[PDB]
């Protein structure tokens, strides 16, 4: 069983994460209201529409009805009226869904973001190893382990005491980040770690895990995905 | 008579024009909720803080309690908070008001943005002439001062109350103001809002000081109100 994302962000940032979770809405009436409001705080900022169904592979899904894509970017209030219509009581269809598609009665409105770089990062039970690992790379490809195992970072958890801030911050310029975005990823990390741990989850992943700018040009990391199983 | 700030922008909004008109908060513990639910849509990003008050020269004004500026740059939730707490309830004193200061029971809580470039722009009723008329300058000395120094860095611009601003009268004032490519007709757009507001509300001053060339987040260049006194 998983949670959908807004959700899934929504606990991140309870537990001190930085998540973009928007703001759900279950019409496009509503869509097109909290992009308006929006607009009231970064006045010209474009937003994204982003089908809430608990299936992977949305961006390049299409819709029963000829629309492409679960994650369409829009560039005003109506824009996001006229996605959101499309997707909010219809039938999404992605590679995890196959022909059967999905029901989607409800997407995420949040603000356009510049990504700088995207991360992959899951945290989940190795039985093979007996302990929890967080995974990680910096590459934009399963296929990335078997090209390129150099490129995955794998670090084992003490089963009792959780991560510490060597693991992390080792796992950080692994990454190739450097200056205060050290901290802000240890930070994020730990956050994400205590999701997981905490609330007794299977997987915790983040995929994309990105480094975005905020309107003023500076640099954080912020979850751009997420997907959290249970049970 | 005057309305405050965020008043007059959601006017400006609700004739098409840009303009940033945050959200207001009636309490500090409201202000960090709005700075906390804001960066769910734009995660890190920074708060500005705005005493709302009818009073001009907020930025370099001082509390009576010792805290300086009447519009205030926060980093976090907590910090509008802190902020927020010193404005709502207390006294701000500018140089419009003298020592007797002013009250303030709300404030403005808007996202940090990157300004680029600060414009004047007043449309006020001209008893000589008759009509309305547009100045404008893209000066940053008070108005009176650079018109002073420089009549000729003022642009004025008589209205035909008839047909209202014409594209020809506005795509030259945009030019002469230094902007070009989707910049001048997005001017154009929010220029005729803004006299739409002028006319249909009855207005005896439209004043935008300043009036903006912002980013968006995605680092898009658009005209934007960043201040408004209407007068009646
Ligand atoms: N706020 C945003 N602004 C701009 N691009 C975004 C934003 N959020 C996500 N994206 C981009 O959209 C892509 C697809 O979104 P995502 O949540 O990963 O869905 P999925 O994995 O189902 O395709 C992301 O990989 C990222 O590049
Ligand atoms: N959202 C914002 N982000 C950054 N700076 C801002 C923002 N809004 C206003 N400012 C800056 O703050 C200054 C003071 O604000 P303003 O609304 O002009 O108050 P006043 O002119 O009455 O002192 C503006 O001239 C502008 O440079
Ligand atoms: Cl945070
Ligand atoms: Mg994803
Ligand atoms: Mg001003
Ligand atoms: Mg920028």
């Known amino acids: 069983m998983n949670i959908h994302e807004w959700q899934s962000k929504q606990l991140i940032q309870k537990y001190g994460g930085r998540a973009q979770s928007g703001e759900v809405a279950f ?23 982003k089908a809430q169904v608990l299936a992977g592979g ?22 996001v009226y006229e996605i959101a219509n499309e997707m909010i009581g219809h039938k999404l269809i992605t590679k ?18 510049k990504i700088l770089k995207e991360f992959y990062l899951s945290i989940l039970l190795d039985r093979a190893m007996g302990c929890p690992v967080i995974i990680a790379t910096s590459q934009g490809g399963e296929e990335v382990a078997q090209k390129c195992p150099e490129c995955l970072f794998k670090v084992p ?11 992390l911050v080792k796992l950080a310029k692994d990454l190739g980040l450097e200056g205060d975005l050290v901290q802000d990823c240890v930070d994020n990390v730990k956050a994400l770690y205590q999701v997981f741990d905490k609330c007794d989850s299977t997987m915790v992943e983040i995929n994309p895990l990105g480094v ?20």
């Open 96 to 113: 995890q869904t196959g022909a059967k598609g999905i029901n989607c009665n409800k997407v995420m409105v949040c603000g356009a973001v």
């Open 27 to 49: 019409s496009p009436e509503r869509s097109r209201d909290i992009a308006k409001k929006l607009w009231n705080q970064f006045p010209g900022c474009k937003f994204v529409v």
């Open 212 to 231: 975005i700018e905020t309107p003023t040009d500076e640099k954080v990391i912020c979850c751009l995905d997420a997907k959290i199983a249970f049970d």
């Open 58 to 79: 949305r961006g390049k899904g299409h819709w029963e009805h000829g629309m492409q894509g679960g994650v369409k970017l829009a560039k005003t209030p109506e824009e």
């Open 157 to 167: 958890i003490s089963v009792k005491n959780g991560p510490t801030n060597e693991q």
